[PDB]
């Protein structure tokens, strides 16, 4: 059968991609950031990773790394660049060293954080990059080295510019998981308030499962091509809160504007929100993080749809329901 | 003048010790974990640290590392051991390599976490160690290698078994700073509730400034000796909360027992607690962290007092007042 190597195999995207590929009968090898094999290594050691590629002889390689500058907070800038930027070059160079240009197809996970400034909305494949963090500059290098090996050596190598994508596995530092975790704990009486920033902020949220599928599709073509991977639909942080609360039978009312805005509990249906009652104030704004910033990230996945036929199949509400259910289960183990 | 080298120079203890020594006219060199000099390095490189000791020719070396297994959360177990355990051996071996046994005095910062289990209370120099985390095992090695170089080579090398010590610089992960930060933010209306564990838990809290002084004293003697460094006085987490709240004019009432216990605002005096009013519930217990655990850490600093004349000079209330004032200042920049 087909063989694949996944770097960053234990993150949200790696775990879902590994499942997706195993289901298709692939033999899956991975390294952290039955027919599944884990290897030691982090992409900082050329010898170790070339050895692994030599033993694995993968048909496909998925270079997933960290997805956000926030998920990389505790690493040194040099370590992040060595693995997310140089690691990409090492993988491409190893494929050449081993004479695998004709057998191995390469996928690199870029990020919407490459847009930094923004300017034009929505953002598409032609929209110019302007990195705003060391992490994003490292990703800029990874994006361009991949384009360069494609253009210079005719290698099948391409980039997936990923916009936000969540799931029950999403890291607790992202706002979506913060909200579902908090709503569940509040409903179960383990906490009392959820503090957020500007609730007007508009986001483009997709489901990790739909995105890892597009990543795989991007390696099944006749020629390599880069693609923006997003939903192209906007929702407010406030709508996300309402949706999450609605999954637990809590209807919310919002009173006040800006840093003064507050979420009041109007009614409660069902038996999953015992720790909440009408009148309760459970959502508020933290001035330390409030900011009325314009110019907004919103991806245009038209090319993906036109050339590949890819479209997100899971809806935002199903994603929220799945995340809420998972956090609710953990929460009741403690009420 | 005298020359000193401090490892972990930017932590709470290192920053205070550096100040203490500079005030005394020392030339101070440091490495992270005017007459002050910072060097690159972390104790993992024998060549780099020997070179530094060779250039510095210190009269005194203070091997401060991490003080808690919680402060070491984001490091790999191997990295922590390499710097906190092996790093200690490297420093002692470099002093010998360079022929500095007669000039350089060595101080190692142990921790009360070496007691793990506990059993006998209070704990003193003779009380047996029983590490309960990888971090503490690394510290056990550091403690014993220091004793061994003292006993085997007649080197002036000793251990300071430190119990909890705080200050305005204390890391936000420790419960004392968590409480002062929270009380200030609540008083300033930036947050609404403080969730803690068992409020009956008894602790031995001293001030970092008093402790770095004992560390220095331990190197001014005629012979090297190990010492427990603590206050030997107990206070409850609940008393700490009351004290912190009292610094902001908030009097508290506690209703309920165990996981049901809650802190209610009785009265408010002054103008530093605008975000709080009588009746408000601002302290509650998080069941996830509640635990009625016996057998309690409490140090017996009698030997320190008897042999060296050391005694903590700063009181717990002055420490709380200082921590609260610092957090209150940060807080009002945002109300």
Swiss-Prot record, chains A, B:
The keyword Transcription does not apply. Its EC number is 4.2.1.47. Homodimer. HAMAP family: GDP_Man_dehydratase (MF_00955). GO terms for molecular function: GDP-mannose 4,6-dehydratase activity; NADP+ binding; protein homodimerization activity. It is an enzyme of class 4 (lyase). NADP(+) binds at residues 8-13, 42-43, 64-68, 79, 139, 165, 170. Pfam families: GDP_Man_Dehyd. This is GDP-mannose 4,6-dehydratase. The active site is at 111, 113 (nucleophile), 135 (nucleophile). The lineage of its organism: Bacteria, Pseudomonadati, Pseudomonadota, Gammaproteobacteria, Enterobacterales.
């Amino acid at each position: 059968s087909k063989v694949a190597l996944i770097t960053g195999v234990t993150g949200q995207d790696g775990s879902y991609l590994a499942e997706f590929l195993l289901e298709k009968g692939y033999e899956v090898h991975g390294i952290k950031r039955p027919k599944f094999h884990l290897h030691y290594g982090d992409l900082s050691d050329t010898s170790n990773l070339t050895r692994i590629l030599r033993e694995v002889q993968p048909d496909e390689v998925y270079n997933l790394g960290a997805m956000s500058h926030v998920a990389v907070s505790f690493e040194s800038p040099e370590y992040t660049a060595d693995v997310d930027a140089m690691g990409t070059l090492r993988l491409l160079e190893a494929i050449r060293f081993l004479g695998l240009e004709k057998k191995t197809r390469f996928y690199q996970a870029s990020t919407s954080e490459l847009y930094g400034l923004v300017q034009e909305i929505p953002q598409k494949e032609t929209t110019p990059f302007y990195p705003r963090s060391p992490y994003a500059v490292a990703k800029l290098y990874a994006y361009w080295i991949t384009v360069n090996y494609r253009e210079s050596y005719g290698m099948y190598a391409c980039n997936g510019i990923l916009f936000n994508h969540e799931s029950p596995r999403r890291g607790e530092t992202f706002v979506t998981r913060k909200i579902t975790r908090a709503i569940a704990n509040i409903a179960q009486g383990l906490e009392s308030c959820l503090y957020l920033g500007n609730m007007d902020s508009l986001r483009d949220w997709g489901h990790a499962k739909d995105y890892v599928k597009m990543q795989w599709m991007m390696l099944q073509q006749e020629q390599p091509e880069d693609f923006v991977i997003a939903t192209g639909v906007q929702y407010s942080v406030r709508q996300f809160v309402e949706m999450a609360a609605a999954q637990l039978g809590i209807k919310l009312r919002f009173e006040g504007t800006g840093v003064e805005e507050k979420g009041i509990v109007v009614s409660v249906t069902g038996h999953d929100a015992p720790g909440v009652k009408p009148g309760d104030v459970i959502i508020a704004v933290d001035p330390r993080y409030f900011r009325p910033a314009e110019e907004t990230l919103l991806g245009d996945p038209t090319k993906a749809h036109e050339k590949l036929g890819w479209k997100p199949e899971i809806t935002l509400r199903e994603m929220v329901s799945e995340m809420v259910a998972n956090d609710l289960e953990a929460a009741k183990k403690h009420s």
